[PDB]
Design a protein around this motif. Structure first.
Motif, PDB file in Angstrom:
ATOM      1  N   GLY A  45      22.324   9.632  48.123  1.00 11.88           N
ATOM      2  CA  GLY A  45      23.116   8.800  47.211  1.00 11.88           C
ATOM      3  C   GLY A  45      22.147   7.945  46.390  1.00 11.88           C
ATOM      4  O   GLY A  45      20.948   8.293  46.228  1.00 11.88           O
ATOM      5  N   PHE A  46      22.636   6.822  45.894  1.00 15.58           N
ATOM      6  CA  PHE A  46      21.891   6.170  44.836  1.00 15.58           C
ATOM      7  C   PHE A  46      22.091   4.657  44.817  1.00 15.58           C
ATOM      8  O   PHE A  46      23.148   4.146  45.201  1.00 15.58           O
ATOM      9  N   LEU A  47      21.067   3.940  44.330  1.00 17.37           N
ATOM     10  CA  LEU A  47      21.286   2.548  43.950  1.00 17.37           C
ATOM     11  C   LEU A  47      21.129   2.578  42.445  1.00 17.37           C
ATOM     12  O   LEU A  47      20.104   3.043  41.920  1.00 17.37           O
ATOM     13  N   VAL A  48      22.154   2.122  41.732  1.00 17.60           N
ATOM     14  CA  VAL A  48      22.279   2.381  40.309  1.00 17.60           C
ATOM     15  C   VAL A  48      22.326   1.018  39.553  1.00 17.60           C
ATOM     16  O   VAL A  48      23.228   0.171  39.826  1.00 17.60           O
ATOM     17  N   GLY A  49      21.429   0.779  38.593  1.00 18.70           N
ATOM     18  CA  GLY A  49      21.454  -0.480  37.909  1.00 18.70           C
ATOM     19  C   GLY A  49      22.181  -0.380  36.565  1.00 18.70           C
ATOM     20  O   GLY A  49      23.389  -0.532  36.485  1.00 18.70           O
ATOM     21  N   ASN A  50      21.439  -0.087  35.501  1.00 22.05           N
ATOM     22  CA  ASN A  50      21.999  -0.120  34.141  1.00 22.05           C
ATOM     23  C   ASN A  50      23.289   0.727  33.986  1.00 22.05           C
ATOM     24  O   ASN A  50      24.264   0.269  33.368  1.00 22.05           O
ATOM     25  N   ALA A  51      23.319   1.921  34.578  1.00 27.36           N
ATOM     26  CA  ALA A  51      24.485   2.815  34.443  1.00 27.36           C
ATOM     27  C   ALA A  51      25.721   2.280  35.202  1.00 27.36           C
ATOM     28  O   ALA A  51      26.868   2.757  34.984  1.00 27.36           O
ATOM     29  N   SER A  52      25.523   1.317  36.116  1.00 24.90           N
ATOM     30  CA  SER A  52      26.644   0.820  36.883  1.00 24.90           C
ATOM     31  C   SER A  52      27.381  -0.287  36.125  1.00 24.90           C
ATOM     32  O   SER A  52      28.408  -0.757  36.601  1.00 24.90           O
ATOM     33  N   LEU A  53      26.897  -0.677  34.958  1.00 24.64           N
ATOM     34  CA  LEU A  53      27.580  -1.711  34.185  1.00 24.64           C
ATOM     35  C   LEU A  53      28.621  -1.071  33.256  1.00 24.64           C
ATOM     36  O   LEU A  53      29.288  -1.799  32.497  1.00 24.64           O
ATOM     37  N   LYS A  54      28.708   0.269  33.307  1.00 23.53           N
ATOM     38  CA  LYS A  54      29.505   1.033  32.347  1.00 23.53           C
ATOM     39  C   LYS A  54      30.672   1.671  33.105  1.00 23.53           C
ATOM     40  O   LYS A  54      30.557   2.096  34.256  1.00 23.53           O
ATOM     41  N   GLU A  55      31.811   1.788  32.424  1.00 16.84           N
ATOM     42  CA  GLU A  55      32.976   2.439  33.057  1.00 16.84           C
ATOM     43  C   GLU A  55      32.657   3.899  33.466  1.00 16.84           C
ATOM     44  O   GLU A  55      33.269   4.450  34.399  1.00 16.84           O
ATOM     45  N   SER A  56      31.731   4.528  32.767  1.00 17.93           N
ATOM     46  CA  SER A  56      31.345   5.891  33.170  1.00 17.93           C
ATOM     47  C   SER A  56      30.586   6.003  34.495  1.00 17.93           C
ATOM     48  O   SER A  56      30.379   7.118  35.049  1.00 17.93           O
ATOM     49  N   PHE A  57      30.247   4.851  35.088  1.00 11.14           N
ATOM     50  CA  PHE A  57      29.720   4.849  36.432  1.00 11.14           C
ATOM     51  C   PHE A  57      30.602   5.696  37.422  1.00 11.14           C
ATOM     52  O   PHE A  57      30.061   6.285  38.285  1.00 11.14           O
ATOM     53  N   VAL A  58      31.935   5.793  37.219  1.00  7.57           N
ATOM     54  CA  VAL A  58      32.778   6.615  38.085  1.00  7.57           C
ATOM     55  C   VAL A  58      32.245   8.054  38.193  1.00  7.57           C
ATOM     56  O   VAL A  58      32.524   8.735  39.149  1.00  7.57           O
ATOM     57  N   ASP A  59      31.616   8.549  37.115  1.00  6.53           N
ATOM     58  CA  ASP A  59      31.143   9.936  37.177  1.00  6.53           C
ATOM     59  C   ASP A  59      29.911  10.074  38.042  1.00  6.53           C
ATOM     60  O   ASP A  59      29.645  11.156  38.599  1.00  6.53           O
ATOM     61  N   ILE A  60      29.109   9.010  38.106  1.00  5.70           N
ATOM     62  CA  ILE A  60      28.056   8.983  39.144  1.00  5.70           C
ATOM     63  C   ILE A  60      28.678   8.991  40.607  1.00  5.70           C
ATOM     64  O   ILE A  60      28.222   9.784  41.460  1.00  5.70           O
ATOM     65  N   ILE A  61      29.728   8.190  40.893  1.00  6.34           N
ATOM     66  CA  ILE A  61      30.435   8.299  42.186  1.00  6.34           C
ATOM     67  C   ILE A  61      30.928   9.733  42.421  1.00  6.34           C
ATOM     68  O   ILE A  61      30.681  10.309  43.468  1.00  6.34           O
ATOM     69  N   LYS A  62      31.518  10.316  41.364  1.00  2.00           N
ATOM     70  CA  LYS A  62      32.025  11.706  41.509  1.00  2.00           C
ATOM     71  C   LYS A  62      30.948  12.692  41.943  1.00  2.00           C
ATOM     72  O   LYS A  62      31.264  13.663  42.646  1.00  2.00           O
ATOM     73  N   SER A  63      29.704  12.485  41.514  1.00  2.00           N
ATOM     74  CA  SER A  63      28.650  13.428  41.927  1.00  2.00           C
ATOM     75  C   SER A  63      28.419  13.457  43.445  1.00  2.00           C
ATOM     76  O   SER A  63      27.860  14.454  43.985  1.00  2.00           O
ATOM     77  N   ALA A  64      28.838  12.380  44.139  1.00  2.00           N
ATOM     78  CA  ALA A  64      28.695  12.200  45.591  1.00  2.00           C
ATOM     79  C   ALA A  64      29.940  12.573  46.337  1.00  2.00           C
ATOM     80  O   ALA A  64      29.972  12.419  47.553  1.00  2.00           O
ATOM     81  N   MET A  65      30.964  13.069  45.623  1.00  2.00           N
ATOM     82  CA  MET A  65      32.258  13.321  46.235  1.00  2.00           C
ATOM     83  C   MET A  65      32.344  14.764  46.659  1.00  2.00           C
ATOM     84  O   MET A  65      33.233  15.103  47.460  1.00  2.00           O
TER      85      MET A  65
END
Length: 246
Positions: free
Chosen positions: A226-246
């Protein structure tokens, strides 16, 4: 091993922008018994954030004191976090080591305090571009991980994060092969010092400019959980990073 995705908002947010963002994150249907997702707001935003996020999202704070309660103006103790039912902490982040002179010994003392007070800890480390260019990456990482690894007693409650410093905030993401090589060494240290079962249980995340385009190729690697996510986690598209782990 349950995969683990964490949003580090760093020093960002307003009351309004967190309402808008948590609303988008709440719309993602995921099962928190299959994947841990954790949000790390600024301290003063923690209450607002915890109230707005649905409980499928875990929450935590971005730093915790190496001292217990007492005369430490400005610090938040693990005891105080425990009494606010704060679940997670980040320890060892590059920004704290860089701007605020946090040492490996500070990291060890914060993890000790955190585990003593029923906090789960996301503990970060990684080599500078200079150390990588001197071919010192594994030696560096081995020293940083050995600074605290003997303190871990429950291998679900400490999560390790490899974030090579040159990848943080720069867009210069490690490749999946570069990350994997280091994660395999980190897991081997845990195996050596803690035992095979413990090494197979512990999560080791990658961080350093993870984004929606590159997250699936990273998490496919055997030892990247999994990941610790900085800049990309401030964006609503961060959900697609969660989806990669689903």
């Amino acid at each position: 091993r349950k995969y683990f995705v964490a949003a580090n908002w760093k020093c960002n947010g307003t009351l309004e922008s967190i309402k808008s963002l948590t609303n988008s994150f709440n719309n993602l249907d995921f099962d928190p018994s299959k994947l841990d997702v954790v949000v790390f707001p600024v301290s003063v935003h923690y209450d607002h954030t915890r109230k707005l996020l649905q409980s499928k999202f875990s929450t935590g704070i971005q730093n915790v004191s190496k001292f217990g309660n007492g005369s430490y103006t400005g610090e938040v103790s693990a005891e105080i976090a425990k009494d606010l039912n704060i679940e997670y902490v980040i320890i060892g982040h590059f920004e704290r080591r860089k701007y605020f002179h946090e040492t490996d010994e500070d990291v060890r003392e914060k993890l000790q305090a955190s585990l003593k007070n029923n906090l789960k800890a996301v503990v970060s480390f990684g080599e500078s571009l200079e150390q990588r260019e001197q071919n010192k990456t594994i030696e560096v990482i081995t020293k940083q991980v050995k600074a605290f690894v003997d303190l871990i007693d429950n291998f679900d409650n400490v999560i390790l994060v490899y974030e090579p410093l040159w990848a943080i905030g720069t867009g210069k993401t490690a490749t999946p092969e570069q990350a994997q090589l280091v994660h395999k060494e980190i897991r081997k240290i845990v195996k050596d010092t803690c035992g095979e079962k413990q090494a197979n249980q512990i999560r080791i995340l990658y961080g350093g400019s993870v984004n929606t385009e590159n997250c699936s190729s990273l998490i496919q690697q055997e030892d990247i959980d999994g990941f610790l996510v900085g800049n990309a986690s401030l964006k609503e598209s961060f959900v697609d990073i969660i989806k990669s782990a689903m």
